[PDB]
């Protein structure tokens, strides 16, 4: 993809009625890090599934192992869960040449606080201003009220 979504705002897509070649991507190695959980990095397009999902988001290099089936970590536990009952591959490309800007990338918004941790394969794109304090948010930012 030219561009991904943030982790919290996880971009979900479903594969059905087609064939994707997972072993080809692994061996061409256009992504720098390939880790697979419950599935093989190769000879995987020989395994039959009816609903294959391939979803896109952005993480840091130290987070690549965290976003994975059966794994935990700050990103895996708070902004995108992947339970032990699921299997799949986590494929990561360093996009620094397209996405990094001096001053930061404002097209991707990272979630720090949620009232509860985000669920398995849940997408949430909300920017509703977070209520941290006792004084309710009025649709504007203020102390203990922030995007």
């Amino acid at each position, epitope marked *: 993809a030219t561009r991904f979504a943030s982790v919290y705002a996880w971009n979900r897509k479903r594969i059905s009625n087609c064939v994707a070649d997972y072993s080809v991507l692994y061996n061409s190695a256009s992504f720098s890090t390939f880790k697979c959980y419950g599935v093989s990095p190769t000879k995987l397009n020989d395994l039959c599934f009816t609903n294959v999902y391939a979803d896109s988001f952005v993480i840091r290099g130290d987070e690549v192992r965290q976003i994975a089936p059966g794994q935990t970590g700050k990103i895996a536990d*708070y902004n995108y869960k992947l339970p032990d009952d699921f299997t799949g591959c986590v494929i990561a490309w360093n996009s620094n040449n397209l996405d990094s800007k001096v001053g930061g990338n404002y097209n991707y918004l990272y979630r*720090l606080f949620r009232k509860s941790n985000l669920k398995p394969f849940e997408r949430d794109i909300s920017t509703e201003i977070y209520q941290a*304090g006792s004084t309710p948010c009025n649709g504007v*930012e*203020g*102390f*203990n*009220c*922030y995007f």
Partner: antibody, heavy 120, light 108 residues
Framework: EVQLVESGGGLVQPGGSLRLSCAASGFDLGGYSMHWVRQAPGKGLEWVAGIYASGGATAYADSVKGRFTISADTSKNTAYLQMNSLRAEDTAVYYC?????????????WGQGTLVTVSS | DIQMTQSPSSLSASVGDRVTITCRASQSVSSAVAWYQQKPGKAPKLLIYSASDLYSGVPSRFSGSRSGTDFTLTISSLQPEDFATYYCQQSHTYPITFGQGTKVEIKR
């Protein structure tokens, strides 16, 4: 390398006041709140006050509410703390610090501290 | 007003050993738990800015994780320059509070 630098320390008579200042170096204050943190002799850290650099919203620690006032200025890339009605118990090293938004993040930027004493 | 408690008040570890500090807020502060290092005469140095994130410029020796409500705060391989009083901080809400300070001995 990003650092903050405190100034304006000194001595206050009980019931008096002192104004602290801190300048940021190596980064842009916008997007972060500016905070003041205190360490009295024999004590660990206690947060005192803070303001959002890009919004102007403020809040204070319960221990200083109604007594302390703060401000920040992103064109100067500096910040201030006005401490009135001080007592001997407020003797402490005051530190400047900055963090994202209005909270939830730690002090991404931190200074060296300046000593403020109060005494009879 | 959310208070923080730490335990133990001191830990004994030699150079190369591990130091573990347990800290918790009285109320949830989510992932926002920081860590500072203080030597006599100096400002505490920020090590961790949030429980979830290590501060830039800080050695990889310093790390931690969450389980339930608690924050396990640790030094994986203690160095001579790490013998300092450490503080745990929550920064979710105001006032921002800190624990009591945990000291480290070098097993002499």
């Amino acid at each position: 390398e990003v650092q903050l630098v405190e100034s304006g320390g000194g001595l206050v008579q009980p019931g008096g006041s002192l104004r602290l200042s801190c300048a940021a170096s190596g980064f842009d204050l916008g997007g972060y709140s500016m905070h003041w943190v205190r360490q009295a002799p024999g004590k660990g850290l206690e947060w005192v006050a803070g303001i959002y650099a890009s919004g102007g919203a403020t809040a204070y620690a319960d221990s200083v509410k109604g007594r302390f006032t703060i401000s920040a200025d992103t064109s100067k890339n500096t910040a201030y703390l006005q401490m009135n009605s001080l007592r001997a118990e407020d003797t402490a090293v005051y530190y400047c610090a900055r963090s994202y938004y209005y909270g939830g993040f730690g002090m991404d930027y931190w200074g060296q501290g300046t000593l403020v004493t109060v005494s009879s | 007003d959310i208070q923080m408690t730490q335990s133990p008040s001191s830990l004994s570890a030699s150079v190369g050993d591990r130091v573990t500090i347990t800290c918790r807020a009285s109320q949830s502060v989510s992932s926002a738990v920081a860590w500072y290092q203080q030597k006599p005469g100096k400002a505490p140095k920020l090590l961790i800015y949030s429980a979830s994130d290590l501060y830039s410029g800080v050695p990889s020796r310093f790390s931690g994780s969450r389980s339930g409500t608690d924050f396990t705060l640790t030094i994986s391989s203690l160095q001579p320059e790490d013998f300092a009083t450490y503080y745990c901080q929550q920064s979710h809400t105001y006032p921002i509070t800190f624990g009591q300070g945990t000291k480290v001995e070098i097993k002499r």
